[PDB]
Design a protein around this ligand. Sequence first.
Ligand SMILES: *C(=O)[C@@H]([C@@H]1NC(C(=O)O)=C(S[C@@H]2CN[C@H](C(=O)Nc3cccc(C(=O)O)c3)C2)[C@@H]1C)[C@@H](C)O
Ligand SMILES: *C(=O)[C@@H]([C@@H]1NC(C(=O)O)=C(S[C@@H]2CN[C@H](C(=O)Nc3cccc(C(=O)O)c3)C2)[C@@H]1C)[C@@H](C)O
Lengths: 505, 505
Amino acid sequence: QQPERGKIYDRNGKVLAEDVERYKLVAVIDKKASANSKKPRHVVDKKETAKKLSTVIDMKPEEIEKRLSQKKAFQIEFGRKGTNLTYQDKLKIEKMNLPGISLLPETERFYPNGNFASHLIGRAQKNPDTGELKGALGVEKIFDSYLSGKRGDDVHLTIDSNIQVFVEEALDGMVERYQPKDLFAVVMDAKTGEILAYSQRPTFNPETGKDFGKKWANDLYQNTYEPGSTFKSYGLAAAIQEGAFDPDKKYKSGHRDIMGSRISDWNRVGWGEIPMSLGFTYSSNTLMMHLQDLVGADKMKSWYERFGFGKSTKGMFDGEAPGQIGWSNELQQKTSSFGQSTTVTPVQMLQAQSAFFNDGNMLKPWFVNSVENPVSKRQFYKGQKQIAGKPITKDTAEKVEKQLDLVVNSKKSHAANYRIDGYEVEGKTGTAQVAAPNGGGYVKGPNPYFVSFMGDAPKKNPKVIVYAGMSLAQKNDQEAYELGVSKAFKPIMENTLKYLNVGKS
Amino acid sequence: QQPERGKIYDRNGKVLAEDVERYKLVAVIDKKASANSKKPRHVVDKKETAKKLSTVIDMKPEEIEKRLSQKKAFQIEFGRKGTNLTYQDKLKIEKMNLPGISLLPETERFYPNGNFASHLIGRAQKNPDTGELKGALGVEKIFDSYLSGKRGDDVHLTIDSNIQVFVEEALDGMVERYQPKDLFAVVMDAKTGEILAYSQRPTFNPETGKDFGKKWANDLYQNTYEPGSTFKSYGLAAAIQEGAFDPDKKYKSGHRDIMGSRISDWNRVGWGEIPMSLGFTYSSNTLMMHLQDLVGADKMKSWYERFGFGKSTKGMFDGEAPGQIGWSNELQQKTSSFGQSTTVTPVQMLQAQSAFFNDGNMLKPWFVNSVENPVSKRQFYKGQKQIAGKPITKDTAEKVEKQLDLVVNSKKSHAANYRIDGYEVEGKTGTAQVAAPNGGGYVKGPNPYFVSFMGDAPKKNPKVIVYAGMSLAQKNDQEAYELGVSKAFKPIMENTLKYLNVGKS
Ligand SMILES: *C(=O)[C@@H]([C@@H]1NC(C(=O)O)=C(S[C@@H]2CN[C@H](C(=O)Nc3cccc(C(=O)O)c3)C2)[C@@H]1C)[C@@H](C)O
Ligand SMILES: *C(=O)[C@@H]([C@@H]1NC(C(=O)O)=C(S[C@@H]2CN[C@H](C(=O)Nc3cccc(C(=O)O)c3)C2)[C@@H]1C)[C@@H](C)O
């Protein structure tokens, strides 16, 4: 028999995955089993056996009887409906005292919460010959050789199930309303980098296997996005340190001509000669292009690299994507300033944003708290807060934070739909075009956007960062353009802050 | 967006896997798409569009109309039935000139032979957002970083498609006839170790994904078996080399009393005082136990290790199982002499068996011929024949081969069902009990056996080794006990020798 596979735990000791015993229904149907026996050891009345067994398994009495009639066979099973039976299903069948009926014990992998952080936890699959389980995605795969066994090691995550529930419920709401092609939300402790909650859509159910394999990629570590205007914060931070951003100095908005192409602010005309601070509140593309000119393209590329972009964060997930900084020509450089051409992972965005709230120190995000064996007490691994680098000074960080405050809370804001009543919110919005997966160019349509928000609360001294992103709503794409991910960000952030005992304004 | 993923080829350059273009059906249903256009650019007649589209995709006209009626939606797709469409499917729909209907090109992973060496080749899965493909089993996974791109590298196998066809057809026959729980066949070049064909049952279809994930374990490299009497050849080889086996010296058959358990020959009574050669032809358990006593338990354990058992063969498959030599106490030792308690992988058996046909040198089995890039011409890897060790002398090998010949061809043989008309065959049979995966005994029942044959032909100087094994037939289990895997070995071996131009007599 196999050693017990280790358990996966959340940060408070709740089981996310474990081994349980279930039962498989077996019917001996050959008369030769009762040749030299006092009481029958096979099924005598196929019809009565079918009726009574039908009251415990999800199979019609006609089908049980048909399967019971198979010839040249000593015993039969009943397919998917006959296995994974509970301990109460077992007791019910055995009271029936049906001749030739028995239940075989089987080990299964149990996920108590069903569809729940599924793309992070993953799923283990069973080799029916030996009962051996092997992880095929996420934590179950990454740590397969520790979890596997006389008893395997346990893996404790930084996930908080109470916060995970808020994220799962918000994402179900987004799917219902917007039916987007892709969707993710992540909650990170703003001061440690711990991943407190993470989910995506579409996803699978590790308990049932439903939809497993339809999308291999974990959004947090393996999928890449052109982030859009959330990426302007790192352009802004660079501009501040170089002395190029002055919040009150005016600049020419409108458009710029780059290698013969017209790139303009989102309203085509701009706002004339406006202060640089208002440019960022308005999410002016020409501000960012102007700032790049002042800093210099060469210096700006290094800045984005110093913020950790273009390379893996070296987390503990398999196949972490590196992204890439689009810098080949001046058109790629200029569109990178507002988050197109350059591709990122959500975990890179969390790593970079954390600098604004830790005196300029980027925090390496992390989700594995411990790998340890509960019998021997050996601890193999313990997660830690770690500074991934310090690209900016304390003063630049605070000056970035002042413009993020204004993005949500200026009189001239266009992001008031992210406000939560009783909590002070800040962050940056994004409404990015999405590259055509085959045809080249960008995906066309009425509002073909990846909409996102990189937010934190309470502002200035936040408890958590919440990053949510929604790609290509197929339903209500007008409203997705207007409201972004506000219908996910608000319940996630509000419920998280209350559960973390932060006081309402 | 994505580089072309490299191809998997067979040994003669036939494609086993490649990237193809397929098509996705898209319907624009919003009237606003035809606001400034003379001819309609959206679906005007839902009922006629559905009826006509119902003729190219597998969807009933009511459902096409129901999807076309979705509200707050600009474009709609048709789920799995609307994608993976062929180039002819495209031409047929475009001839209809339906307003608002179009086809998008999509890259798919194409397996030209469908269900074919599936657990060796594996399957790549697509991330719908980016089109990025990732191997999830077998070669597609093991070599994912080479196959992935630019243009990815090709992987050439030693598989011969012509011989693989013989193996797929033979295993289809065994399933229909025997409905076993597990089944495998492998064909290896007797002089190089090249794996010329390999398959198992149950398995999946890499092209459609049907049944993928139901069994993760590759039988050749990852599954373990109590081999049974096929393992006696290595006990025999040790005894020959140690001077303990003399073919004409008689021994007492019947039973031996081992730690209070009576272990007897398969006919319970034995054959009296018979020569050791006849003992082996009969698959005598007491012969192997007597020989083990003569050699010594300590010396015999080392012998099985020099035959490569108990450790991985260090092949190129992921997670190769090591097996284990069952040696805790004398009852484990003595049952190991006839292939119970000890567990092995089929690849270890091919490796050990090859010693008898290469002057005592074990050949390390291998299935990867080349990893190379067709653009740059860089070769990253080239497979080759490799000696895993020389545990026996040339003389011992010859004396083993003489007994394997007799097993099939003695007048007193019980393996005459493995004879092929016109070809001289040799090998060893096995009829082994199977450990219950849960609980602590053997699978009970009328014939609860893993039956197998380790055969080679022509005898003395074989071209290929054919190892087939069938675990726990649920249909015709009496016949499986009597005939073993003969109904698989014979068409596989006969068709292969003919394809290799070996002369029939
Ligand atoms: C960055 O992603 C992108 C530019 N930034 C943003 C952003 O979301 O911050 C946009 S979206 C643009 C600026 N905000 C405007 C807005 O919310 N207007 C609005 C509100 C409600 C209704 C309507 C309507 O009636 O359509 C409009 C719109 C901007 C594209 C970079 C890459 O350009
Ligand atoms: C090894 O696996 C096992 C012993 N070896 C083998 C073997 O397959 O070589 C067996 S099977 C045993 C010997 N061959 C006998 C047989 O085929 N008898 C037979 C043939 C046709 C009809 C009948 C019938 O009328 O029932 C019987 C059976 C043997 C168990 C070790 C582990 O013991």
